[PDB]
Amino acid sequence: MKEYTLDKAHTDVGFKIKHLQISNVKGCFKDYSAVIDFDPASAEFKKLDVTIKIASVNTENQTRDNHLQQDDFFKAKKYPDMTFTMKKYEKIDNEKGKMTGTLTIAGVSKDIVLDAEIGGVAKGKDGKEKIGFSLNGKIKRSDFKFATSTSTITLSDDINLNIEVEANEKE
Amino acid sequence: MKEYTLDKAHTDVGFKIKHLQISNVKGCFKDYSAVIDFDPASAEFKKLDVTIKIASVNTENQTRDNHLQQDDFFKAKKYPDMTFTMKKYEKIDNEKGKMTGTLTIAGVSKDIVLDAEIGGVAKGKDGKEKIGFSLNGKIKRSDFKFATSTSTITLSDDINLNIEVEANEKE
Amino acid sequence: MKEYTLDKAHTDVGFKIKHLQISNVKGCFKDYSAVIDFDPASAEFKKLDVTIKIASVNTENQTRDNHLQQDDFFKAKKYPDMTFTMKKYEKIDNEKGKMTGTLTIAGVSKDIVLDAEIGGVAKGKDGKEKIGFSLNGKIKRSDFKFATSTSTITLSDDINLNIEVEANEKE
Amino acid sequence: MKEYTLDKAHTDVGFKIKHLQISNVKGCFKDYSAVIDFDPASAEFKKLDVTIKIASVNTENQTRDNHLQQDDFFKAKKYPDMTFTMKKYEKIDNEKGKMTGTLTIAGVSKDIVLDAEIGGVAKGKDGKEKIGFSLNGKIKRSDFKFATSTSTITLSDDINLNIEVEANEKE
């Protein structure tokens, strides 16, 4: 038997433990087109049709973006774009309305409601019209059978849409 | 009715989605004492008694460390230290054995098994003895009623102990 | 050395593995009062004030119900009731409107929006009025600092309100 | 305007909220073979070779069992069986030892340690030998690239092996 004394400098009294953390992935799309018909006299949308190129996704992370294009997500080779088509605008007041339309994600189509909030209807620098509005609403991955492989535990069934638009008159 | 054209520069076609991520918290304790009796002739531990000052925890994050001291964790005001006392060393060979002892976390005591791995038994620079060994084992929070408030979902019931020791002879 | 043969009848080649499962807790309250002012001429609510006795919760499970009354939930000893007070009804059409009001959970008050859906405005068996409507909306535990101890991982930050009302005229 | 009174009998003041629950899946295999060489004189295993038919899995649930056979699990069409081959038995005492062997799950092989606990070495009813022992140990899905598609969040990386054997001498 012999007696020893730690050397605290080359000793580590260590432990490892596993925890879960919840976090929001924030994303946008760099490339999309839209057609916008709005009547400032009555604060009503008449047509809103948007096409978004899945390819142009950006979640501030290059390898996740690529991953989004694959089978277990967007399948961007087969379905390069997502579309929204307005079917009904129901005015609440001049700042607010309920927009109903058809969202199409990888060939699957559902009717969704977005909350329109009109934040500013002006004549511009030059005297041609501008508008600023937001569209907000929650959609369910399950409704669109999006990422069906991924559990609703790992990744939320709920996606929150925040469309912020500034826009100028045509011709 | 009027027609508009997005201004892509002040437009954001955005989304937010919630996901879970698993991660290991790695930690050590800066301040502990130990008594170590080991026989290099037979590669057997004779006594191993460790006291660890909960206060000296370090998980590379100052506010989590403080939080560990509180009611829902260590209760370091009431129970400032954790103790390990060896009860039995069962040799497997000269590199390996099973250590049994009593771990005490905030006044609750359980007998645990650690895997002893002896990685090097030498005479030092000066001709006095040194040893290097590790102790590894998994304990369950539930066995010690540690952090009973915190779900075994958020934070793992399993804690992995990695004690890495270098040590020098006495007097 | 000796050779053996399993006895399959008293042998178990076993394993245990831990998984997560997501589930909806559905609940109602057995005891509540309300005041309801509605104009069938215009399909508008004029007053809607509801008080709910926390004590009367029912999630089809007796010990969870009790648990809901405690500090980490409702604190029903201190705050026996939750209240909703309508502040604004904004008509969309005769079947649909947006209701705004003040919800109060254990002394904390936030303004919420419910989606009113009027499903049937009749004169009854006896020739006195009836109405049937629903109120639906999502509130966040965090907005009300409800169950702050419980992680948004274990238990969803989002609660979905489904109020289904059938109701008869007064006097 | 008109005043109404709830009809509590056809009114539901309801809510829905999502929570996580952790649970152990317990399982065994109905069909396996083994070869067992054990020396009661010295309480040492000499050979332990087990083959398990993946097809014979039973987790007390018929549709989960089928699911286990598929690509995201066992791939039982391609890899119908799992094998264990003892490489080393290291005696601790007559009741206890450390078993080392090669586990093979769907063509991927890793060396694992099981804790042998010998609970009873007798001569039987008839005067021929019997033994009862257990083998226990934890393996990691990740080490075997098992169910790589399934997150370590939904389903634990750790599987706990409990082999309980009763067995009788040969010829």
How does this structure look, described?
With 171 residues, chain A is mostly beta strands. Chain A has a single domain, classed as Lipid/polyisoprenoid-binding, YceI-like (Lipocalin, Beta Barrel), CATH 2.40.128. Helices cover 4% and strands 63% of the residues of chain A. The first copy, chain A, has one helix spanning 62-68; strands at residues 2-6, 12-29, 32-39, 44-53, 57-58, 81-91, 96-105, 108-123, 129-140, 155-169. The longest helix of chain A has 7 residues, at 62-68. Chain A is elongated, with a radius of gyration of 24 Å. The interface between A and B is large, with 58 and 58 residues.
CATH architecture of chain A: Beta Barrel
Q: Main sheet of chain A?
A: 7 strands, antiparallel
Q: What multimeric state do the chains show? A: homotetramer
Structural class of chain A: mainly beta
CATH topology of chain A: Lipocalin
Read across the widest sheet of chain A, the strand sequence of neighbours is: 3-4-6-7-8-9-10
Q: What is the number of E strands of chain A?
A: 10
Radius of gyration of chain A: 24 Å
What is the helix content of chain A? under 10%
Please report the number of helical segments of chain A.
Answer: 1
CATH class of chain A: Mainly Beta
InterPro entries (chains A, B, C, D): Lipid/polyisoprenoid-bd_YceI (IPR007372), TTHA0802/YceI-like_sf (IPR036761)
Domain Lipid/polyisoprenoid-binding YceI-like (chains A, B, C, D): 3-168
Pfam family, one (chains A, B, C, D): YceI
Keywords (chains A, B, C, D): Signal
